[PDB]
Structure formats: structure tokens, C-alpha cells
RNA sequence: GUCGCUGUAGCUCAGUUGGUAGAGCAUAGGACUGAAAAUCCUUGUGUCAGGAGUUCGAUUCUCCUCGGCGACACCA
RNA sequence: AAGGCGAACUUCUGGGUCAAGACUGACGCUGAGUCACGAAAGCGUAGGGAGCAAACAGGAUUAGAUACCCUGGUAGUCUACGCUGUAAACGAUGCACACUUGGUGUUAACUAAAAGUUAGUACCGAAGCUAACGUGUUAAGUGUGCCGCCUGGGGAGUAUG
């Protein structure tokens, strides 16, 4: 239950910057957007397949560009 | 005419609406406000500006309950939740904590099905 | 594969199943 | 698409009665048919009539203030995102401010009911000076129509 | 609007004329309220018929269709069917929301 | 016959223990979309059913009616 | 072995891997019928039913919308037992053995650990192979054992038994 205690002299701005950062580092919003509505285990597996393939092609691409240069 | 001093502000910020409730430390509600009640309707109800207006109106409702000391609770993925907290600050009522109560299940209650089958 | 052949098989299967559904409950 | 247009002429700051560019621009907006002399005469006579309807010596002052009473601040420009058209507010630029003002006064004066040339336009000019009439009505309408739809102000691209 | 049937180097049998009309009533339930004009040009040039259909939409779209054939009835059937299908496609273009 | 009431914008509805004549819908105009829709904005729409009295002035306060009401009791 | 298997614990229980670490001494491979298992959906009996959700109802989009979208919603989804034995049940590649350059990760074990080996598991890739795509020590390379299966498309996985 992500909390950010605001000090007496601490500013609201950085206070909610800390809140935003540790929310993002708990990944609450991404989890909620993931659980909005159901997905077949098949399609979870397939999207992970494709994401990893995209990552591999992009990395090979990046290294090719680095050596091409 | 009552004095409480301490209090809580709950803010639900979903994709469709924003609801701001001002309540005791015990949780008993003092007042509330909503984007739908603030005259907006349609996609306006979820813009950050509407969230700001809704929150500040909710607090203006409770100017005279003798409170300057609130705990902020947030749930929902709405865009302008930061705007809700920012407006609570802008009104001058000081905050002592900011929290989230967004419910994260441990995998129960199979959710709705996808859109565009 | 082009997939036209798979589509042909699909429509064939649908027609056969429809025939069987029609003639179910008949006696 | 290839932006940064060539530098405008801008050299016509009318060297006839006031050495002022804004009067020249107003006369140009006034023009029909390609008749600069007619426009200049009508505008000069009309502003003189205004300055003696309000009985002040400095005509520049009253003319400029009656313009600035109509120059708007925020207007509505339509964009569309995701197959949804949104009438986002956006702050005008100063040149567009004079343009919209002069256009509004000119349209109201032309479409009004009056006897004559400078008659119509001087009458409209003092109505603007007093912050009332068709031109001021249109200006405030645009203003608070933009303000009634300020939710989408975060679309300024 | 109502459709304009023009002909070049040919003579209109009333049979084929009301054939064309009978093929064109397909528009005045769905498409008529969306178009400016619908022209149908028949030509007879190389012992064959050449048909040019043309439609203008209220939102700036222009549809044209050209075909050749040997028998007027068959050519009209194919050309009008193609025209109606393309018009439906454009209407759906715009109404997809 | 009696009781509880109402009549205010074209419709619906406020109306403040007396000094506002409006709210929502709709109508008309501008803007938006390709139209129809939905925003958004302007704009009209009144002896506030009639009369007497109370007040310094009355939609409002009282009373007497006009027309329409809901509900109750008799009905040879 | 495949289907498949993810909160925690116990009980019952199957399989694999490594080694000088002794024993048996070819006791093996594959396998027509046959038998067992076999996602999900479905069926019978008896329970359970939060959420989700065929059929179905209403509201919208549309010329129409028996759909996509929205609000609801019965079977079903769950448990016990008994049936059905079908999937793009896929690595679209049957199983087993003897061989045939490497690069970069990773799991387990041996080693205190590195470092290497062995048994897996991924990416790239030499030769070779391939109609091409690609494959390439987890071959679709070089050899064989046995089983299953194919012989133009539609009719047709139909008619009939």
C-alpha cells in the first residue's frame, strides 16, 4: 500500500514525484491495466513470443548498425 | 459548526469519472463531489482539468469543518490524479500523507472479456 | 500456405455440420 | 509544409495622416474592388466623426482603444484525435488579434442598418468603444465559448 | 438528383432503358441521399459496348467505372453491380466511425 | 356533498414565510461531422387563470370565484 | 510419453541424470491387432454457483444488424463418479543407434570456486543438404532397423455397410 509521508517542511511537488516514482517501481498502474479484462493464456504466450522476437531483431539491428559505422 | 482538524480525502480516478470524498479520520464522510456533478459530461469527465475542478470544489464544500490536515488516498488509472493532489495542495489545506488503495487481486474473479471480439 | 485451401475446407465443414444439425431430431 | 514564409511587406505604415501601420491595415481590410483612395477617405472621415462624437482631440487614442476592446485573447481551433473532433482552445497571436478585431468590426458595420458610409462605420466604432454591439457581442461569444470548453486545453500541438 | 443515361452511336430499346432503370432502383434506399450525380454513358464502338458509370459523393469522392462487353444486358449487369459495390465501399469508408 | 390541492415559457418543473420571473426539454441562429446524431454557445417563450382585500409595493399573503384536478362519503 | 503441471504443508507414489562401483552376461530396437492415458467443448447422476458467460432480452451503429459496442442474463465454467476419445493434440519434422567444424547464453551434477567435462535447454552459423523458404551435433547432413502414411483437383471424408 504505497505511501509517501509528507514532511512538515517538504514541498508537495517532490512529494508526489516520490509517490509517482515508487508507484512506477511497484508497477501498480501497469498491473491494473493488465487486469482490466481477461486474456487467453494462449494469447499471453503468443504476445510474449512476439515481444521477445521483436527484442532480438532490434538488438541484432542495433549491433549491425554499430558495426556498419 | 464543528471542528475536526484531521481528515482524509479519497479520490477515485477511473477512465470515465472522478469522485472526491472528504471524510473523517474514522472514515465517516463529510462531503463529496464528482465530475458528473460539476456539470461536465462525455469525455470531459476524465480530463485532468475536470479532476482539478472536482477536487477543489469538494474541498471548498468543507472549508468550514475546521480541518487543515488530510491523508490523501488514490485509486484508479485516471490521467489527472496528480492534478487532483496538486489542486488539494493549491487550496492551501496541508497534506500529511499520500497513499494508494488500488485493488490488486491475487488472481481471483476472472475479469471481463476483450473488446472487439 | 495461401490459405484458400484451408478456407475451402472450412466452408465444406460448415455445410456438412449444418446438414447434420438439420437432420438431427428428425426420425 | 515548407514553413518560415518569406518576410511580409510590412512597409506600408501609411505616411498620409498618422504614420501608423494599424490605420493602413484597417483601410486595406476595408477595401472593395481595389479602391484604396475610396477606402482611405471613408476611414479618415469616419474616425474624424467618431473623434467629434466623443469630442477628444487625439483620434489615435480613441481608435486604438476601440480596437483593443475587440482584440480577443483565446480562440477555438478544431483538431481531431482518434476519430473524435475536439474544439481545443488556443491562444491567438497579436497579428491575428488585429485581424479578427478588424474583420469583426467591418462585418458588423457592413451588415448593420445605416444611412451612409462613414455613418455606418463610425456608429459601429463608437459602439465598440462603449463595449456593446454586434462586434463586441461576437468577441465575447468567442471568448467564453472557448472558455466553456477549456477541458481540452492540453492538446495544444 | 436523378440518374442521367447518355448514349453514343446507339439506339435505346425501351427494354434496355427500363432494364437500366430497374438495375438503378438499388440506389434509392441507401445511397441517393449521399451523391450529387450519377451518369451512365453507353458507347458502341468496336462491334462491342463500352460502358462508363460515374458517381459523385457529397464528401468530395468521385467514383468512375469503365467496362467493355459484347451483349448489352450482360455488360449493364456487370457494370452496375461493380458501381453499386464500389459506392457501398465508399459509404462504409466514411461511416466506419 | 366533502376533504387534500394545483393553473408560472410550447411541454415538464422550481419558486425562498413578500422586493427574480426563471430551471430542464424543445424552438431558432452560429460553430463542429461527410450527413443524420451528440456536444458547445447564443436566443426568444409571461397581466405567473380573474377579481377584491393585506403591504409602501403582491405569482407569492388571505379571501371570493373560473376551469381542471386527485381522494373520501351518500346515491330515493 | 503426450495432453499437461505454479499459494503453503504432510502422506502415498512414477520417472530421469551422474560414477569404476560392484553384480547379471545381449536379457535389445521397433512394433499390425489389442490395451492404457488423452486440452477444451459435450453427455448421465448428485451437489455447488461469487465472478465470467453460448442461447436469450433490452439499448445503440446501420438501408437492414438474427453481429462487432453497451447494460443484463440461463446452461456451462467448479466438485465426486460414470461416458465421449476429438484439436493448428505442431517442432505441421515417428522411434532407436553409430558418426560428422564452431560461436554466444542458460539449467542440473562433479570440482571450494574459477576452468573443464557430462546430461539437457535456446540463439547465430562453416561444410553439407534443400524447389526455395530455410535447416545445420536438439539435421531437414552421412547410414541402417521397424512401424504409420501418400499416388491430380472437385465430388468427398460424402453415400452405403
Short mmCIF file of N, CA and C in Angstrom, two decimals, chain D:
data_model
loop_
_atom_site.label_atom_id
_atom_site.label_comp_id
_atom_site.label_asym_id
_atom_site.label_seq_id
_atom_site.Cartn_x
_atom_site.Cartn_y
_atom_site.Cartn_z
N UNK D 1 3.74 23.34 -46.03
CA UNK D 1 4.62 22.36 -45.42
C UNK D 1 6.02 22.92 -45.24
N UNK D 2 6.53 23.58 -46.28
CA UNK D 2 7.83 24.26 -46.19
C UNK D 2 7.59 25.61 -45.53
N UNK D 3 7.66 25.62 -44.20
CA UNK D 3 7.24 26.76 -43.40
C UNK D 3 8.32 27.84 -43.42
N UNK D 4 8.20 28.80 -42.50
CA UNK D 4 9.02 30.02 -42.46
C UNK D 4 8.84 30.82 -43.76
N UNK D 5 7.62 31.32 -43.92
CA UNK D 5 7.26 32.12 -45.07
C UNK D 5 8.20 33.31 -45.22
N UNK D 6 8.29 33.82 -46.44
CA UNK D 6 9.11 34.99 -46.73
C UNK D 6 8.60 36.19 -45.93
N UNK D 7 9.53 37.08 -45.59
CA UNK D 7 9.20 38.25 -44.78
C UNK D 7 8.12 39.08 -45.44
N UNK D 8 7.08 39.41 -44.67
CA UNK D 8 5.96 40.16 -45.20
C UNK D 8 6.44 41.53 -45.68
N UNK D 9 5.62 42.17 -46.52
CA UNK D 9 5.93 43.51 -47.00
C UNK D 9 6.12 44.46 -45.81
N UNK D 10 5.04 44.72 -45.07
CA UNK D 10 5.09 45.41 -43.79
C UNK D 10 5.54 46.86 -43.95
N UNK D 11 5.95 47.24 -45.16
CA UNK D 11 6.50 48.56 -45.41
C UNK D 11 5.43 49.64 -45.51
N UNK D 12 4.15 49.26 -45.55
CA UNK D 12 3.07 50.23 -45.68
C UNK D 12 2.61 50.57 -44.26
N UNK D 13 3.30 51.52 -43.65
CA UNK D 13 2.84 52.19 -42.44
C UNK D 13 2.45 53.58 -42.91
N UNK D 14 1.15 53.78 -43.11
CA UNK D 14 0.64 54.80 -44.02
C UNK D 14 1.21 56.18 -43.69
N UNK D 15 1.97 56.74 -44.63
CA UNK D 15 2.60 58.05 -44.46
C UNK D 15 1.71 59.17 -44.99
N UNK D 16 0.45 59.17 -44.57
CA UNK D 16 -0.53 60.10 -45.09
C UNK D 16 -1.13 60.98 -44.01
N UNK D 17 -1.54 60.39 -42.89
CA UNK D 17 -2.19 61.18 -41.87
C UNK D 17 -1.62 60.90 -40.49
N UNK D 18 -1.08 59.70 -40.28
CA UNK D 18 -0.67 59.36 -38.93
C UNK D 18 0.65 58.62 -38.82
N UNK D 19 1.28 58.23 -39.92
CA UNK D 19 2.48 57.40 -39.89
C UNK D 19 2.27 56.17 -39.01
N UNK D 20 1.07 55.59 -39.11
CA UNK D 20 0.69 54.44 -38.30
C UNK D 20 0.36 53.28 -39.22
N UNK D 21 0.88 52.10 -38.89
CA UNK D 21 0.60 50.92 -39.70
C UNK D 21 -0.82 50.40 -39.48
N UNK D 22 -1.39 50.62 -38.30
CA UNK D 22 -2.63 49.94 -37.99
C UNK D 22 -3.78 50.55 -38.77
N UNK D 23 -3.75 51.87 -38.98
CA UNK D 23 -4.76 52.52 -39.80
C UNK D 23 -4.67 52.03 -41.23
N UNK D 24 -3.45 51.90 -41.75
CA UNK D 24 -3.26 51.37 -43.10
C UNK D 24 -3.84 49.98 -43.22
N UNK D 25 -3.56 49.12 -42.24
CA UNK D 25 -4.07 47.76 -42.28
C UNK D 25 -5.59 47.75 -42.23
N UNK D 26 -6.18 48.62 -41.40
CA UNK D 26 -7.63 48.69 -41.33
C UNK D 26 -8.23 49.13 -42.66
N UNK D 27 -7.62 50.13 -43.30
CA UNK D 27 -8.12 50.56 -44.60
C UNK D 27 -8.02 49.44 -45.62
N UNK D 28 -6.91 48.70 -45.60
CA UNK D 28 -6.75 47.59 -46.53
C UNK D 28 -7.83 46.54 -46.32
N UNK D 29 -8.12 46.20 -45.07
CA UNK D 29 -9.21 45.27 -44.82
C UNK D 29 -10.54 45.85 -45.28
N UNK D 30 -10.68 47.20 -45.24
CA UNK D 30 -11.92 47.85 -45.67
C UNK D 30 -12.16 47.69 -47.16
N UNK D 31 -11.09 47.54 -47.94
CA UNK D 31 -11.17 47.71 -49.39
C UNK D 31 -12.16 46.77 -50.06
N UNK D 32 -13.01 47.32 -50.93
CA UNK D 32 -13.66 46.59 -52.00
C UNK D 32 -12.98 46.92 -53.33
N UNK D 33 -12.99 45.94 -54.23
CA UNK D 33 -12.93 46.18 -55.66
C UNK D 33 -11.58 46.72 -56.11
N UNK D 34 -10.66 46.96 -55.18
CA UNK D 34 -9.39 47.59 -55.50
C UNK D 34 -9.49 49.10 -55.59
N UNK D 35 -9.88 49.77 -54.49
CA UNK D 35 -10.18 51.20 -54.47
C UNK D 35 -9.61 51.80 -53.17
N UNK D 36 -8.29 51.95 -53.16
CA UNK D 36 -7.60 52.37 -51.96
C UNK D 36 -7.98 53.79 -51.57
N UNK D 37 -8.13 54.68 -52.55
CA UNK D 37 -8.46 56.06 -52.24
C UNK D 37 -9.82 56.17 -51.59
N UNK D 38 -10.80 55.42 -52.11
CA UNK D 38 -12.13 55.42 -51.50
C UNK D 38 -12.06 54.92 -50.07
N UNK D 39 -11.33 53.82 -49.86
CA UNK D 39 -11.23 53.29 -48.50
C UNK D 39 -10.57 54.29 -47.56
N UNK D 40 -9.49 54.93 -48.01
CA UNK D 40 -8.77 55.88 -47.17
C UNK D 40 -9.66 57.04 -46.79
N UNK D 41 -10.39 57.59 -47.77
CA UNK D 41 -11.27 58.72 -47.48
C UNK D 41 -12.36 58.32 -46.50
N UNK D 42 -12.98 57.15 -46.72
CA UNK D 42 -14.06 56.73 -45.83
C UNK D 42 -13.54 56.56 -44.41
N UNK D 43 -12.39 55.91 -44.27
CA UNK D 43 -11.86 55.66 -42.93
C UNK D 43 -11.48 56.96 -42.23
N UNK D 44 -10.83 57.87 -42.95
CA UNK D 44 -10.44 59.14 -42.33
C UNK D 44 -11.67 59.91 -41.87
N UNK D 45 -12.66 60.04 -42.74
CA UNK D 45 -13.86 60.77 -42.37
C UNK D 45 -14.58 60.11 -41.21
N UNK D 46 -14.63 58.78 -41.20
CA UNK D 46 -15.36 58.08 -40.15
C UNK D 46 -14.68 58.23 -38.80
N UNK D 47 -13.35 58.09 -38.75
CA UNK D 47 -12.67 58.25 -37.47
C UNK D 47 -12.76 59.69 -36.99
N UNK D 48 -12.73 60.66 -37.90
CA UNK D 48 -12.96 62.05 -37.51
C UNK D 48 -14.33 62.21 -36.88
N UNK D 49 -15.35 61.63 -37.51
CA UNK D 49 -16.70 61.70 -36.97
C UNK D 49 -16.76 61.06 -35.59
N UNK D 50 -16.04 59.95 -35.40
CA UNK D 50 -16.01 59.33 -34.08
C UNK D 50 -15.35 60.24 -33.06
N UNK D 51 -14.22 60.85 -33.44
CA UNK D 51 -13.48 61.68 -32.50
C UNK D 51 -14.26 62.91 -32.10
N UNK D 52 -15.14 63.41 -32.97
CA UNK D 52 -16.00 64.51 -32.56
C UNK D 52 -17.35 64.05 -31.99
N UNK D 53 -17.73 62.78 -32.15
CA UNK D 53 -18.85 62.29 -31.37
C UNK D 53 -18.45 62.06 -29.93
N UNK D 54 -17.18 61.75 -29.70
CA UNK D 54 -16.70 61.64 -28.33
C UNK D 54 -15.95 62.87 -27.88
N UNK D 55 -15.77 63.85 -28.76
CA UNK D 55 -15.10 65.13 -28.52
C UNK D 55 -13.79 64.98 -27.74
N UNK D 56 -12.81 64.34 -28.39
CA UNK D 56 -11.42 64.39 -27.96
C UNK D 56 -10.56 64.82 -29.14
N UNK D 57 -9.43 65.46 -28.82
CA UNK D 57 -8.52 65.91 -29.86
C UNK D 57 -7.75 64.75 -30.48
N UNK D 58 -7.25 63.84 -29.65
CA UNK D 58 -6.40 62.75 -30.12
C UNK D 58 -7.27 61.62 -30.64
N UNK D 59 -7.27 61.43 -31.96
CA UNK D 59 -8.12 60.42 -32.58
C UNK D 59 -7.47 59.03 -32.51
N UNK D 60 -6.14 58.99 -32.63
CA UNK D 60 -5.39 57.76 -32.40
C UNK D 60 -5.82 57.07 -31.12
N UNK D 61 -5.95 57.82 -30.03
CA UNK D 61 -6.24 57.20 -28.74
C UNK D 61 -7.57 56.46 -28.79
N UNK D 62 -8.63 57.14 -29.22
CA UNK D 62 -9.95 56.53 -29.18
C UNK D 62 -10.05 55.39 -30.19
N UNK D 63 -9.45 55.56 -31.37
CA UNK D 63 -9.47 54.50 -32.37
C UNK D 63 -8.77 53.25 -31.85
N UNK D 64 -7.57 53.43 -31.29
CA UNK D 64 -6.81 52.30 -30.79
C UNK D 64 -7.53 51.61 -29.65
N UNK D 65 -8.17 52.37 -28.76
CA UNK D 65 -8.83 51.71 -27.65
C UNK D 65 -10.08 50.97 -28.11
N UNK D 66 -10.80 51.53 -29.09
CA UNK D 66 -11.96 50.81 -29.61
C UNK D 66 -11.55 49.55 -30.34
N UNK D 67 -10.34 49.52 -30.92
CA UNK D 67 -9.80 48.27 -31.43
C UNK D 67 -9.49 47.30 -30.30
N UNK D 68 -8.75 47.77 -29.30
CA UNK D 68 -8.30 46.88 -28.23
C UNK D 68 -9.46 46.36 -27.40
N UNK D 69 -10.61 47.02 -27.45
CA UNK D 69 -11.81 46.49 -26.81
C UNK D 69 -12.39 45.30 -27.56
N UNK D 70 -11.94 45.05 -28.78
CA UNK D 70 -12.41 43.91 -29.56
C UNK D 70 -11.32 42.88 -29.81
N UNK D 71 -10.06 43.24 -29.67
CA UNK D 71 -9.00 42.26 -29.89
C UNK D 71 -9.14 41.10 -28.91
N UNK D 72 -9.31 39.87 -29.39
CA UNK D 72 -9.58 38.74 -28.48
C UNK D 72 -8.31 38.12 -27.92
N UNK D 73 -8.47 37.15 -27.03
CA UNK D 73 -7.35 36.55 -26.30
C UNK D 73 -7.16 35.07 -26.62
N UNK D 74 -8.21 34.27 -26.50
CA UNK D 74 -8.14 32.83 -26.75
C UNK D 74 -9.28 32.46 -27.69
N UNK D 75 -8.97 31.68 -28.72
CA UNK D 75 -9.96 31.29 -29.70
C UNK D 75 -10.03 29.78 -29.79
N UNK D 76 -10.94 29.30 -30.62
CA UNK D 76 -11.21 27.87 -30.76
C UNK D 76 -10.66 27.42 -32.10
N UNK D 77 -9.80 26.40 -32.07
CA UNK D 77 -9.30 25.76 -33.27
C UNK D 77 -9.65 24.28 -33.19
N UNK D 78 -10.14 23.72 -34.28
CA UNK D 78 -10.59 22.34 -34.26
C UNK D 78 -9.47 21.40 -34.68
N UNK D 79 -9.18 20.42 -33.84
CA UNK D 79 -8.34 19.30 -34.21
C UNK D 79 -9.17 18.04 -34.08
N UNK D 80 -8.57 16.89 -34.37
CA UNK D 80 -9.28 15.65 -34.15
C UNK D 80 -8.29 14.54 -33.84
N UNK D 81 -8.59 13.77 -32.80
CA UNK D 81 -7.76 12.66 -32.35
C UNK D 81 -8.64 11.43 -32.23
N UNK D 82 -8.19 10.32 -32.80
CA UNK D 82 -8.91 9.07 -32.68
C UNK D 82 -10.32 9.12 -33.24
N UNK D 83 -10.50 9.74 -34.40
CA UNK D 83 -11.83 9.85 -34.96
C UNK D 83 -12.79 10.66 -34.12
N UNK D 84 -12.26 11.51 -33.25
CA UNK D 84 -13.06 12.40 -32.42
C UNK D 84 -12.57 13.82 -32.64
N UNK D 85 -13.45 14.70 -33.09
CA UNK D 85 -13.09 16.09 -33.33
C UNK D 85 -13.31 16.91 -32.06
N UNK D 86 -12.27 17.63 -31.66
CA UNK D 86 -12.27 18.42 -30.44
C UNK D 86 -11.93 19.86 -30.76
N UNK D 87 -12.70 20.78 -30.20
CA UNK D 87 -12.57 22.21 -30.49
C UNK D 87 -11.67 22.86 -29.44
N UNK D 88 -10.38 22.59 -29.58
CA UNK D 88 -9.46 22.93 -28.49
C UNK D 88 -9.25 24.43 -28.45
N UNK D 89 -9.18 25.03 -27.26
CA UNK D 89 -8.80 26.44 -27.18
C UNK D 89 -7.32 26.61 -27.45
N UNK D 90 -6.98 27.77 -27.99
CA UNK D 90 -5.59 28.10 -28.28
C UNK D 90 -5.44 29.61 -28.26
N UNK D 91 -4.31 30.07 -27.75
CA UNK D 91 -4.03 31.49 -27.66
C UNK D 91 -3.67 32.03 -29.04
N UNK D 92 -4.33 33.10 -29.44
CA UNK D 92 -4.08 33.74 -30.72
C UNK D 92 -2.75 34.48 -30.64
N UNK D 93 -2.21 34.85 -31.79
CA UNK D 93 -1.06 35.73 -31.88
C UNK D 93 -1.54 37.16 -32.13
N UNK D 94 -0.66 38.13 -31.86
CA UNK D 94 -1.09 39.53 -31.88
C UNK D 94 -1.59 39.95 -33.25
N UNK D 95 -0.88 39.58 -34.31
CA UNK D 95 -1.32 39.94 -35.66
C UNK D 95 -2.71 39.40 -35.93
N UNK D 96 -2.94 38.14 -35.58
CA UNK D 96 -4.27 37.56 -35.72
C UNK D 96 -5.27 38.29 -34.84
N UNK D 97 -4.81 38.88 -33.73
CA UNK D 97 -5.70 39.68 -32.90
C UNK D 97 -6.22 40.88 -33.67
N UNK D 98 -5.32 41.66 -34.27
CA UNK D 98 -5.81 42.80 -35.04
C UNK D 98 -6.69 42.32 -36.18
N UNK D 99 -6.30 41.22 -36.82
CA UNK D 99 -7.07 40.73 -37.96
C UNK D 99 -8.50 40.39 -37.56
N UNK D 100 -8.66 39.59 -36.50
CA UNK D 100 -10.00 39.20 -36.06
C UNK D 100 -10.81 40.40 -35.64
N UNK D 101 -10.20 41.33 -34.90
CA UNK D 101 -10.91 42.53 -34.49
C UNK D 101 -11.43 43.27 -35.71
N UNK D 102 -10.52 43.68 -36.60
CA UNK D 102 -10.90 44.47 -37.75
C UNK D 102 -11.94 43.76 -38.59
N UNK D 103 -11.79 42.45 -38.78
CA UNK D 103 -12.78 41.68 -39.51
C UNK D 103 -14.15 41.79 -38.86
N UNK D 104 -14.20 41.68 -37.53
CA UNK D 104 -15.48 41.70 -36.85
C UNK D 104 -16.15 43.06 -36.95
N UNK D 105 -15.41 44.14 -36.67
CA UNK D 105 -15.98 45.47 -36.83
C UNK D 105 -16.47 45.66 -38.26
N UNK D 106 -15.66 45.29 -39.25
CA UNK D 106 -16.02 45.55 -40.64
C UNK D 106 -17.29 44.81 -41.00
N UNK D 107 -17.37 43.54 -40.62
CA UNK D 107 -18.55 42.76 -40.97
C UNK D 107 -19.80 43.33 -40.31
N UNK D 108 -19.71 43.67 -39.03
CA UNK D 108 -20.87 44.22 -38.34
C UNK D 108 -21.30 45.55 -38.96
N UNK D 109 -20.34 46.42 -39.26
CA UNK D 109 -20.67 47.72 -39.84
C UNK D 109 -21.31 47.57 -41.21
N UNK D 110 -20.74 46.70 -42.05
CA UNK D 110 -21.31 46.49 -43.38
C UNK D 110 -22.71 45.91 -43.30
N UNK D 111 -22.94 44.96 -42.40
CA UNK D 111 -24.23 44.31 -42.33
C UNK D 111 -25.24 45.05 -41.46
N UNK D 112 -24.84 46.14 -40.83
CA UNK D 112 -25.76 46.90 -40.00
C UNK D 112 -26.79 47.61 -40.87
N UNK D 113 -27.66 48.38 -40.23
CA UNK D 113 -28.57 49.28 -40.92
C UNK D 113 -28.09 50.71 -40.69
N UNK D 114 -27.85 51.43 -41.78
CA UNK D 114 -27.36 52.78 -41.67
C UNK D 114 -27.69 53.56 -42.92
N UNK D 115 -27.40 54.85 -42.87
CA UNK D 115 -27.69 55.72 -44.00
C UNK D 115 -26.54 55.79 -44.98
N UNK D 116 -25.31 55.84 -44.49
CA UNK D 116 -24.18 56.13 -45.35
C UNK D 116 -22.93 55.46 -44.81
N UNK D 117 -21.80 55.90 -45.35
CA UNK D 117 -20.59 55.09 -45.40
C UNK D 117 -19.86 55.16 -44.08
N UNK D 118 -19.27 56.33 -43.84
CA UNK D 118 -18.70 56.66 -42.56
C UNK D 118 -19.76 56.69 -41.48
N UNK D 119 -21.02 56.92 -41.85
CA UNK D 119 -22.09 56.84 -40.87
C UNK D 119 -22.12 55.47 -40.22
N UNK D 120 -22.31 54.43 -41.04
CA UNK D 120 -22.32 53.07 -40.53
C UNK D 120 -21.05 52.78 -39.74
N UNK D 121 -19.90 53.11 -40.30
CA UNK D 121 -18.69 52.61 -39.66
C UNK D 121 -18.34 53.40 -38.39
N UNK D 122 -18.58 54.71 -38.36
CA UNK D 122 -18.39 55.47 -37.13
C UNK D 122 -19.34 55.00 -36.04
N UNK D 123 -20.61 54.76 -36.39
CA UNK D 123 -21.56 54.28 -35.41
C UNK D 123 -21.08 52.97 -34.80
N UNK D 124 -20.65 52.04 -35.64
CA UNK D 124 -20.14 50.77 -35.13
C UNK D 124 -18.90 50.99 -34.28
N UNK D 125 -18.04 51.92 -34.69
CA UNK D 125 -16.81 52.16 -33.94
C UNK D 125 -17.09 52.66 -32.54
N UNK D 126 -18.05 53.57 -32.37
CA UNK D 126 -18.32 54.01 -31.01
C UNK D 126 -19.06 52.95 -30.21
N UNK D 127 -19.89 52.14 -30.86
CA UNK D 127 -20.48 51.02 -30.13
C UNK D 127 -19.39 50.12 -29.57
N UNK D 128 -18.37 49.83 -30.37
CA UNK D 128 -17.23 49.07 -29.86
C UNK D 128 -16.53 49.82 -28.74
N UNK D 129 -16.34 51.13 -28.91
CA UNK D 129 -15.72 51.94 -27.87
C UNK D 129 -16.45 51.79 -26.54
N UNK D 130 -17.77 51.73 -26.60
CA UNK D 130 -18.60 51.55 -25.42
C UNK D 130 -18.84 50.08 -25.08
N UNK D 131 -18.18 49.16 -25.79
CA UNK D 131 -18.17 47.75 -25.42
C UNK D 131 -19.57 47.15 -25.50
N UNK D 132 -20.21 47.36 -26.65
CA UNK D 132 -21.57 46.93 -26.90
C UNK D 132 -21.79 46.96 -28.40
N UNK D 133 -22.63 46.06 -28.89
CA UNK D 133 -22.91 45.95 -30.31
C UNK D 133 -22.57 44.57 -30.84
N UNK D 134 -22.72 44.43 -32.16
CA UNK D 134 -22.50 43.14 -32.78
C UNK D 134 -21.05 42.70 -32.66
N UNK D 135 -20.11 43.62 -32.84
CA UNK D 135 -18.70 43.25 -32.81
C UNK D 135 -18.28 42.79 -31.42
N UNK D 136 -18.62 43.57 -30.39
CA UNK D 136 -18.29 43.15 -29.03
C UNK D 136 -19.03 41.88 -28.66
N UNK D 137 -20.27 41.74 -29.12
CA UNK D 137 -21.01 40.51 -28.84
C UNK D 137 -20.30 39.31 -29.42
N UNK D 138 -19.84 39.42 -30.67
CA UNK D 138 -19.11 38.32 -31.28
C UNK D 138 -17.82 38.03 -30.54
N UNK D 139 -17.11 39.08 -30.12
CA UNK D 139 -15.85 38.86 -29.41
C UNK D 139 -16.08 38.12 -28.11
N UNK D 140 -17.04 38.58 -27.31
CA UNK D 140 -17.28 37.90 -26.04
C UNK D 140 -17.82 36.50 -26.28
N UNK D 141 -18.61 36.31 -27.34
CA UNK D 141 -19.09 34.97 -27.66
C UNK D 141 -17.93 34.03 -27.92
N UNK D 142 -16.97 34.45 -28.75
CA UNK D 142 -15.81 33.61 -28.99
C UNK D 142 -15.04 33.37 -27.71
N UNK D 143 -14.83 34.42 -26.92
CA UNK D 143 -14.10 34.29 -25.66
C UNK D 143 -14.71 33.20 -24.79
N UNK D 144 -15.96 33.37 -24.40
CA UNK D 144 -16.50 32.43 -23.43
C UNK D 144 -17.00 31.14 -24.07
N UNK D 145 -17.12 31.04 -25.39
CA UNK D 145 -17.22 29.72 -25.99
C UNK D 145 -15.91 28.95 -25.83
N UNK D 146 -14.78 29.61 -26.06
CA UNK D 146 -13.51 28.95 -25.81
C UNK D 146 -13.39 28.57 -24.34
N UNK D 147 -13.82 29.46 -23.45
CA UNK D 147 -13.70 29.20 -22.02
C UNK D 147 -14.64 28.09 -21.57
N UNK D 148 -15.83 27.99 -22.16
CA UNK D 148 -16.75 26.91 -21.81
C UNK D 148 -16.22 25.55 -22.20
N UNK D 149 -15.17 25.51 -23.02
CA UNK D 149 -14.58 24.26 -23.48
C UNK D 149 -13.09 24.24 -23.19
N UNK D 150 -12.72 24.58 -21.96
CA UNK D 150 -11.31 24.65 -21.60
C UNK D 150 -10.74 23.30 -21.18
N UNK D 151 -11.56 22.26 -21.12
CA UNK D 151 -11.07 20.96 -20.67
C UNK D 151 -9.97 20.44 -21.59
N UNK D 152 -10.12 20.66 -22.89
CA UNK D 152 -9.19 20.12 -23.87
C UNK D 152 -7.97 20.98 -24.06
N UNK D 153 -7.64 21.86 -23.12
CA UNK D 153 -6.55 22.80 -23.33
C UNK D 153 -5.19 22.13 -23.40
N UNK D 154 -5.09 20.85 -23.05
CA UNK D 154 -3.83 20.11 -23.09
C UNK D 154 -3.59 19.44 -24.44
N UNK D 155 -4.16 19.98 -25.52
CA UNK D 155 -4.00 19.44 -26.86
C UNK D 155 -3.30 20.44 -27.78
N UNK D 156 -2.48 21.31 -27.22
CA UNK D 156 -2.01 22.50 -27.95
C UNK D 156 -1.04 22.19 -29.10
N UNK D 157 -0.78 20.95 -29.49
CA UNK D 157 0.13 20.67 -30.59
C UNK D 157 -0.40 21.22 -31.91
#
